[PDB]
Amino acid sequence: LVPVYIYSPEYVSMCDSLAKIPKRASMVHSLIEAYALHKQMRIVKPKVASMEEMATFHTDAYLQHLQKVSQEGDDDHPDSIEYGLGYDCPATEGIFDYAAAIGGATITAAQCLIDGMCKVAINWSGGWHHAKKDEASGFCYLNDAVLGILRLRRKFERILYVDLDLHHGDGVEDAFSFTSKVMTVSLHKFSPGFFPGTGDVSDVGLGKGRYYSVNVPIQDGIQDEKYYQICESVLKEVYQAFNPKAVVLQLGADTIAGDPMCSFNMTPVGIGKCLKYILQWQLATLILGGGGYNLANMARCWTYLTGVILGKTLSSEIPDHEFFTAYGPDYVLEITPSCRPDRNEPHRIQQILNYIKGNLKHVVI
Ligand SMILES: CC(/C=C/C(=O)NO)=C\[C@@H](C)C(=O)c1ccc(N(C)C)cc1
Ligand SMILES: [K+]
Ligand SMILES: [K+]
Ligand SMILES: [Zn+2]
Numbered sequence: 001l002v003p004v005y006i007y008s009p010e011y012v013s014m015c016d017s018l019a020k021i022p023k024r025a026s027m028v029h030s031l032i033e034a035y036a037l038h039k040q041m042r043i044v045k046p047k048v049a050s051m052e053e054m055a056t057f058h059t060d061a062y063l064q065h066l067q068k069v070s071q072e073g074d075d076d077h078p079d080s081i082e083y084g085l086g087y088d089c090p091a092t093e094g095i096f097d098y099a100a101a102i103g104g105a106t107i108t109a110a111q112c113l114i115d116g117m118c119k120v121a122i123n124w125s126g127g128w129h130h131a132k133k134d135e136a137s138g139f140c141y142l143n144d145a146v147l148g149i150l151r152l153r154r155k156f157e158r159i160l161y162v163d164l165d166l167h168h169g170d171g172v173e174d175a176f177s178f179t180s181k182v183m184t185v186s187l188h189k190f191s192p193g194f195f196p197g198t199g200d201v202s203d204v205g206l207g208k209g210r211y212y213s214v215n216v217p218i219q220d221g222i223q224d225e226k227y228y229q230i231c232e233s234v235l236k237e238v239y240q241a242f243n244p245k246a247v248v249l250q251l252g253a254d255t256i257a258g259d260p261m262c263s264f265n266m267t268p269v270g271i272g273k274c275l276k277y278i279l280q281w282q283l284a285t286l287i288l289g290g291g292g293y294n295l296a297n298m299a300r301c302w303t304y305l306t307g308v309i310l311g312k313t314l315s316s317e318i319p320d321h322e323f324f325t326a327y328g329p330d331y332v333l334e335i336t337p338s339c340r341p342d343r344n345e346p347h348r349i350q351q352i353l354n355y356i357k358g359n360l361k362h363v364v365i
Helices: 009-017 024-034 060-071 095-114 144-152 170-175 224-242 268-279 295-310 346-364
Strands: 004-006 042-044 120-123 159-163 182-189 213-218 246-250 284-288
Touching (some): 004 095, 024 295, 042 095, 060 095, 095 120, 095 144, 095 284, 120 295, 144 159, 144 170, 170 182, 268 295
Parallel strands (some): 004 042, 004 120, 120 284, 159 182
């Protein structure tokens, strides 16, 4: 009925403690609260993930290792080499607790979807799609997206994962690569030297999971209109061929114009239209956050997207709240595209969509 919003003051504090950008969860929640959107959702206190719950995807050796180097901040452990710790993913003190809360918040939201508590569950602090079963990658130590999907596997036999982050959700695609129960769809920037380096259109999975992985390689400077047409064409084809019963959606904000990544040229409006097309499926939807390195932009994006889920049209003027001064110099909710060219050739885009049409033919047949 009413969208579940995963939040507790203790959870946000935990998320700000070891965040990449300081006060990541604070700003996003403070702005949502400022628009009084929390009063129209069902606020649910997240439960910290147990060792067994994480073990549904991650190996035991890896989990024990995190717990050991997290209590003292041992960034010099001789077993860290095996698990990808920790140059890109530092072995900072209390990192396992940080991952436990966020991992447990996605599972909690998934549990609300199972028990029929709602049709939509939101966790903006979640959605780290890079982590592997026994390896940390790209700031991700625990793949909370996979943990969420595995929780939904208790009720749903057809789960669709849609990744709209700037980067390819490799950790999630790799997790369900050998299965047809979960189809992963990832729209991302794909160029040599760009992280994580995988996710070409020819990457369709392995074994019995072949053709159940879908990748859309996109180039720099793409804007709302062209992006949506790509997203609509893929999701329409996938919905018919896969027939999902539940949806997990990762909405990273590193695609938005004004992000330090400086790749895609998106505004929250474009992603909003993508979210609308998925919401009208009337399926149990698990909304996750993701990447983003422009704090105020992330807040503007995810706050607007929360308004989309609720159907509310938000005021263009940023209301006075705790972090109001961070929204200079215009102090508005809208985000304007930068003056950069679109390097996506209309023929290559159509050529990719045709591959996907060809690959999904195998699924439906
Ligand atoms: C891991 C990642 C994003 C993942 C993501 O967004 N997953 O969703 C990006 C890495 C490769 C990167 O490009 C980078 C660039 C600059 C930088 N500093 C200037 C500190 C730190 C990292
Ligand atoms: K993506
Ligand atoms: K798959
Ligand atoms: Zn990203």
